[PDB]
Enzyme design. Structure first.
Site, mmCIF file in Angstrom:
data_model
loop_
_atom_site.group_PDB
_atom_site.id
_atom_site.type_symbol
_atom_site.label_atom_id
_atom_site.label_comp_id
_atom_site.label_asym_id
_atom_site.label_seq_id
_atom_site.Cartn_x
_atom_site.Cartn_y
_atom_site.Cartn_z
ATOM 1 N N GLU A 119 36.697 62.595 49.477
ATOM 2 C CA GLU A 119 36.731 64.005 49.849
ATOM 3 C C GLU A 119 35.819 64.212 51.047
ATOM 4 O OE1 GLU A 119 35.171 68.356 48.095
ATOM 5 O OE2 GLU A 119 35.741 66.774 46.696
ATOM 6 N N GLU A 124 31.550 74.163 54.178
ATOM 7 C CA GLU A 124 31.420 75.014 53.004
ATOM 8 C C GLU A 124 30.322 76.014 53.255
ATOM 9 O OE1 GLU A 124 31.904 73.102 48.933
ATOM 10 O OE2 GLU A 124 31.252 71.385 50.151
#
Ligand SMILES: [Ca+2]
Length: 242
Positions: A119, A124
């Site tokens: 990932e 974020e």
């Protein structure tokens, strides 16, 4: 040539249009996302649609029944780049409990389980950090709380939610470097994952979402102003000599 645009979604279209289904899937439901998140992802245009100004808008809302809805869109099985500068221009949402992200999962997921499939979190943000974003990789032996992460703060003490910013990874064999507004803030290479397997030399698919609630961001409170919009001007993949 390096710098050539290889692929993009520019989110062209009239106000109220759906995102292009030849590129994007909508994930759905309020279960299985982990992290104790609250939102129910939907395929409704109430949670994802184009604005007629060249942006995708993902909207997190509170529904009459007290549930929260949002969207989580992926390019799995539709566009799976391997290397390049992967960049989105995004105006993130704001507020306590809001958790927007632009990220990638390995193309072998879920047959190869997470985190062995890899990932790459390009951007974020959590609502209680309006002036910060984070970039991270998760892989086998370096995942979750042991994800290899870096942080970028600002500009000038300002909130990212005020306007559009660019978020990218310059991704090449054995190396990933993170850039906010063209400025490096994190880098990981084959050499920084220790004796663990490097799982990033393969195709990945792209994901855009806005979560509501989670162990990291915490939960909405009385200051959270819904609905909240994440506006995405483009997602682009540029040639970087790979
Ligand atoms: Ca656009």
């Amino acid at each position: 040539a390096p710098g050539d645009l290889l692929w993009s979604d520019e989110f062209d279209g009239a106000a109220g249009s759906a995102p292009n289904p030849a590129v994007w899937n909508h994930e759905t439901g309020a279960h299985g996302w982990g992290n104790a998140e609250l939102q129910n992802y939907t395929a409704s245009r109430a949670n994802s649609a184009l604005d007629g100004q060249g942006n995708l808008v993902i909207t997190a809302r509170r529904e009459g029944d007290g549930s929260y809805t949002s969207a989580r869109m992926t390019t799995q099985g539709k566009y799976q780049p391997q290397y390049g500068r992967i960049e989105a221009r995004i105006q993130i949402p704001r507020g306590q409990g809001i958790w927007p992200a632009f990220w990638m999962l390995g193309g072998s997921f879920p047959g190869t389980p997470w985190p062995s499939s890899g990932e790459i979190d390009i951007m974020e943000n959590v609502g209680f950090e309006p002036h910060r974003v984070h970039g991270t990789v998760h892989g086998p032996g370096y995942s979750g709380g042991s994800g290899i992460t870096g942080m970028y703060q600002h500009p000038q003490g300002w909130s990212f939610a005020d306007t559009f910013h660019t978020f990218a990874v310059d991704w090449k064999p054995g190396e990933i470097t993170w850039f906010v507004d063209g400025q490096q803030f994190h880098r990981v290479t084959r050499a920084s994952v220790g004796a663990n397997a490097w799982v990033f030399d393969q195709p990945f698919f792209l994901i855009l979402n806005v979560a509501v609630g989670g162990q990291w961001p915490g939960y909405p409170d009385g200051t959270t102003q819904l609905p909240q919009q994440m506006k995405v001007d483009y997602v682009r993949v540029y040639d970087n000599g790979s």
